[PDB]
Write an enzyme that holds these catalytic residues in place. Structure first.
Site, PDB file in Angstrom:
ATOM      1  N   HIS B  39       0.744  -1.227   0.057  1.00 48.80           N
ATOM      2  CA  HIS B  39       0.059   0.076   0.127  1.00 48.80           C
ATOM      3  C   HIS B  39       0.854   1.284   0.079  1.00 48.80           C
ATOM      4  CE1 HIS B  39       0.682   0.814   4.448  1.00 48.80           C
ATOM      5  NE2 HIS B  39      -0.087  -0.468   4.585  1.00 48.80           N
ATOM      6  N   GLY B 140       2.247   5.597  10.755  1.00 49.61           N
ATOM      7  CA  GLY B 140       3.782   5.286  10.246  1.00 49.61           C
ATOM      8  C   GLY B 140       4.433   4.010  10.409  1.00 49.61           C
ATOM      9  N   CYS B 142       3.662   0.933   9.555  1.00 50.86           N
ATOM     10  CA  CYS B 142       3.437  -0.233   8.648  1.00 50.86           C
ATOM     11  C   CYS B 142       4.850  -0.513   8.105  1.00 50.86           C
ATOM     12  CB  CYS B 142       2.657   0.439   7.494  1.00 50.86           C
ATOM     13  SG  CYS B 142       0.950   0.941   7.892  1.00 50.86           S
TER      14      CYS B 142
HETATM   15  C1  LIG Z   1      -3.331   3.004   1.941  1.00 48.64           C
HETATM   16  C2  LIG Z   1      -4.375   2.251   3.175  1.00 48.64           C
HETATM   17  C3  LIG Z   1      -4.292   0.845   2.754  1.00 48.64           C
HETATM   18  C4  LIG Z   1      -5.543   3.029   3.024  1.00 48.64           C
HETATM   19  C5  LIG Z   1      -3.629   2.627   4.333  1.00 48.64           C
HETATM   20  C6  LIG Z   1      -3.568   4.134   5.039  1.00 48.64           C
HETATM   21  C7  LIG Z   1      -3.124   4.383   6.337  1.00 48.64           C
HETATM   22  C8  LIG Z   1      -2.277   3.281   6.992  1.00 48.64           C
HETATM   23  N1  LIG Z   1      -1.885   3.819   8.479  1.00 48.64           N
HETATM   24  C9  LIG Z   1      -0.457   4.189   8.378  1.00 48.64           C
HETATM   25  O1  LIG Z   1      -0.070   4.687   9.537  1.00 48.64           O
HETATM   26  C10 LIG Z   1       0.588   4.450   7.363  1.00 48.64           C
HETATM   27  C11 LIG Z   1       1.606   4.824   7.339  1.00 48.64           C
HETATM   28  N2  LIG Z   1       2.247   4.849   6.205  1.00 48.64           N
HETATM   29  C12 LIG Z   1       1.334   4.297   5.100  1.00 48.64           C
HETATM   30  N3  LIG Z   1       0.085   3.840   6.017  1.00 48.64           N
HETATM   31  C13 LIG Z   1      -2.814   3.616   9.551  1.00 48.64           C
HETATM   32  C14 LIG Z   1      -4.084   2.997   9.124  1.00 48.64           C
HETATM   33  O2  LIG Z   1      -4.070   1.725   9.263  1.00 48.64           O
HETATM   34  N4  LIG Z   1      -5.144   3.779   8.720  1.00 48.64           N
HETATM   35  C15 LIG Z   1      -6.319   3.389   8.291  1.00 48.64           C
HETATM   36  C16 LIG Z   1      -6.384   2.189   7.329  1.00 48.64           C
HETATM   37  C17 LIG Z   1      -7.870   1.688   6.793  1.00 48.64           C
HETATM   38  C18 LIG Z   1      -8.838   2.931   7.221  1.00 48.64           C
HETATM   39  C19 LIG Z   1      -8.830   2.995   8.762  1.00 48.64           C
HETATM   40  C20 LIG Z   1      -7.599   3.374   9.333  1.00 48.64           C
HETATM   41  C21 LIG Z   1      -2.220   2.950  10.663  1.00 48.64           C
HETATM   42  C22 LIG Z   1      -2.194   3.426  12.034  1.00 48.64           C
HETATM   43  C23 LIG Z   1      -1.725   3.071  13.239  1.00 48.64           C
HETATM   44  C24 LIG Z   1      -1.076   1.775  13.092  1.00 48.64           C
HETATM   45  N5  LIG Z   1      -1.061   1.146  12.012  1.00 48.64           N
HETATM   46  C25 LIG Z   1      -1.447   1.654  10.585  1.00 48.64           C
HETATM   47  C26 LIG Z   1      -2.330   1.917   6.881  1.00 48.64           C
HETATM   48  C27 LIG Z   1      -2.919   1.524   5.446  1.00 48.64           C
END
Ligand SMILES: CC(C)(C)c1ccc(N(C(=O)c2c[nH]cn2)[C@@H](C(=O)NC2CCCCC2)c2cccnc2)cc1
Ligand SMILES: CC(C)(C)c1ccc(N(C(=O)c2c[nH]cn2)[C@@H](C(=O)NC2CCCCC2)c2cccnc2)cc1
Lengths: 299, 298
Positions: B39, B140, B142
């Protein structure tokens, strides 16, 4: 919610060595050309009280074996400082991290690298309690395991060297100057520690974390000031609260004053009534203000 | 008993910062390959992500990969399930002897929590029956790796952090790109199933209690495995896997596993104001191996 974690251990692992004197083996910490270890490594295999001045006067340098990853370092000299030995070796540790020595105060959190025979086996976070012991998980041979903190700039603070286990199971260490936290003896004597107090500063931090996770059923509407809380605290097994200004960060992000949390502590001390706060059924003094800020905001 | 992590140094030397366009997360550098969540190439958009389209229009020059601020040349990228495999132009000289292993619910492992390619914390966790973990991750995290270290020093790489669910639970993949629990790497809702108490761990916890002289709760009643497993599915507990692995602790305490199965049924609703090793309710945090390692070093 909140999870106790440790700071990464890589930079400290490279400082752990095996220290042997005669038949006795424990761990030491190798920084520059000095290995620090507990002085009881030179204690005789008798069960009486140890005369360390005589033990040190009759010490023989050739009885030492100091090794890192099975590579033996040459022992050059040894001095005794409080409850530690400083073993000078003929080789400096090329992996010595940027570091200082720091003496902990009760309520400080730090990390333990649990070591056996000079090899790290586990890493965990702990808090120095008001009776100057920690609740580690150690088995025999853990002596000389280091406690540390890593500053934002990368400086390692070396703050604890594991010394002894008390009859209660509590763990006792020294700082790297040789001062034993709580002035326990490195002796086979029976030593009963003072009862611990609840770390009020940590309970306040825990309640702020609860507010930030949406958990607010417990919040007292009213307030008690610091002077009133501290009077109550010393009658009910809690520490005095530091100062309200320390919590300015969490107070500003929640809009809840420390005095409201102090009032809530007085209520919650009597019990939760079957409910919980972040999975806890009683007040939690495990997490510091800084840990809550770091785990919630990365700051 | 104390939940602890295995030392992290050999894994720290594999953590890298991976950036695609403006998006930053972590990756794991082994040999000449960096693995990271796919992602990282997702568009800045509110819609469902078409990963085949995102992959077909990816351009290598949009990647930046660094280890402790030293940037690595990016040579190629392939997609495998929910991960990318980024080939870089040099091998990690500090690659530990390692394998890849897929966790099953009830397995303990270690998480190295990382941000911008820099480790900030390490802790032990259990893969729960709903295939999530309870981490302490913020935005962040991930790409943060999960690992175990075998007795011979071989690192098992078993978890790559993927997403946080609305509940706060955390979801990751293995290094082949299979997401645990088959959650999606999407902005959709997603709700995990109800978590079950890990009965194997609860039995270990009660033996630890007995070995520490805490036995007010001990039942003389015996419940056999088949009967316990029927009760467990109706009461939010897993089956108990087997009894024989506990034989060392059963011999030391004189208490059978079947007595502890009966004791779980006795204690399942609460302790009535008492405590067991400071817990007010049954604890499933510790495995048999952890109890035996922490009390006897074996
Ligand atoms: C692109 C996609 C798949 C929608 C996504 C977007 C953001 C992230 N999250 C990054 O923090 C992060 C950092 N760099 C990229 N993403 C956070 C995360 O899950 N939010 C959302 C994902 C689905 C919708 C609800 C919450 C996160 C926070 C704390 C611990 N773990 C992950 C994970 C996936
Ligand atoms: C010589 C002296 C001062 C009496 C001594 C002897 C043994 C140790 N202990 C070593 O494990 C050990 C390993 N190498 C050398 N000592 C254990 C320990 O404290 N026992 C006793 C100390 C006094 C009497 C009660 C218990 C230990 C430490 C940490 C965790 N669990 C067990 C510490 C100090």
């Amino acid at each position: 919610g909140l999870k106790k974690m440790a700071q990464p251990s890589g930079c400290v692992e490279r400082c752990v060595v095996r220290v042997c004197y005669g038949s006795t083996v424990l761990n030491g910490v190798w920084l520059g050309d000095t290995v620090t270890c507990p002085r009881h490594v030179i204690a005789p295999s008798t069960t009486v009280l140890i005369d360390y001045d005589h033990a040190y006067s009759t010490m023989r340098l050739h009885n030492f074996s100091v090794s890192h990853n099975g590579v033996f370092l040459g022992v050059v000299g040894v001095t005794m400082h409080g409850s530690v030995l400083r073993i000078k070796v003929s080789q400096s540790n090329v992996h010595t991290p940027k570091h200082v020595f720091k003496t902990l105060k009760p309520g400080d959190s730090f990390n333990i690298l649990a070591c056996y025979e000079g090899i790290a086996s586990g890493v965990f976070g702990v808090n120095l309690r008001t009776n100057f012991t920690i609740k580690g998980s150690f088995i025999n041979g853990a002596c000389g395991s280091p406690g540390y903190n890593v500053r934002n700039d990368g400086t390692v603070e070396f703050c604890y060297l594991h010394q002894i286990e008390l009859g209660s199971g509590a763990h006792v260490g020294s700082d790297f100057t040789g001062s034993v936290y709580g002035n326990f003896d490195d002796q086979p004597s029976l030593q009963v520690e003072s009862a611990n107090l609840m770390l009020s500063d940590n309970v306040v931090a825990f309640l702020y974390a609860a507010l930030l996770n949406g958990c607010r059923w417990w919040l007292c509407s009213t307030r008690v000031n610091v002077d009133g809380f501290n009077e109550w605290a010393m009658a009910n097994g809690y520490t005095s609260v530091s100062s309200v200004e320390c919590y300015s960060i969490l107070a500003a992000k929640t809009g809840v004053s420390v005095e409201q949390l102090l009032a809530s502590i007085q209520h919650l001390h009597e019990g939760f009534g079957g409910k919980n706060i972040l999975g806890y059924s009683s007040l939690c003094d495990e997490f510091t203000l800084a840990e809550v800020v770091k785990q919630m905001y990365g700051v």
